[PDB]
């Protein structure tokens with residue numbers, strides 16, 4: 565019977581690292597198969613009661629870095645919040661970890677792109693992955709943020 569429902573725009577990023585949009589209760593049986601230790605949530609809105617009960621039942625730690633929303637061309641991605649999320653993401657004790665925002669395209673896309681830059685991927689390869697998820701909502705400003713992101717502090 566075909567019965568597990570990954571959350572919106574779900575993907576495996578690497579060993580122990582996933583990305584998606586916002587999970588709802590239809591996605592909980594699928595997320596249980598991943599044995600998550602952590603969620604990195606990149607939106608400022610409070611976590612719904614449904615989701616909080618899921619986290620408590622499954623022993624999942626919630627890391628929230630509330631990146632405020634803006635639309636092109638009035639978009640300044642907050643460097644500090646991305647870097648705080650990256651510090652949590654790179655700690656293997658937090659794996660398996662699900663990174664999510666609302667649709668998983670912009671905030672989640674920027675965090676994953678910065679991870680890829682730390683993994684020494686060429687920029688065109690980073691942008692191709694970002695574009696695959698963002699599709700018609702791909703933003704030059706997200707890619708410019710990745711282009712100028714200084715990796716020095718994480719090397």
Ligand SMILES: O=C(N[C@@H]1[C@@H](OP(=O)(O)O)[C@H](OP(=O)(O)O)[C@H](OP(=O)(O)O)[C@H](OP(=O)(O)O)[C@H]1OP(=O)(O)O)C(F)(F)P(=O)(O)O
Nearest residue numbers: 607632633634635636665666667668669670671672673701
């Ligand atoms: O969901 C996200 N962003 C959405 C904007 O919402 P906020 O960023 O304001 O929370 C929303 O903006 P408003 O309509 O609320 O201004 C609208 O962006 P838009 O300016 O292009 O309309 C919407 O886009 P649609 O879904 O196309 O409406 C964007 O989500 P994406 O679809 O991921 O771009 C996100 F959190 F950035 P993501 O990282 O999950 O992609």
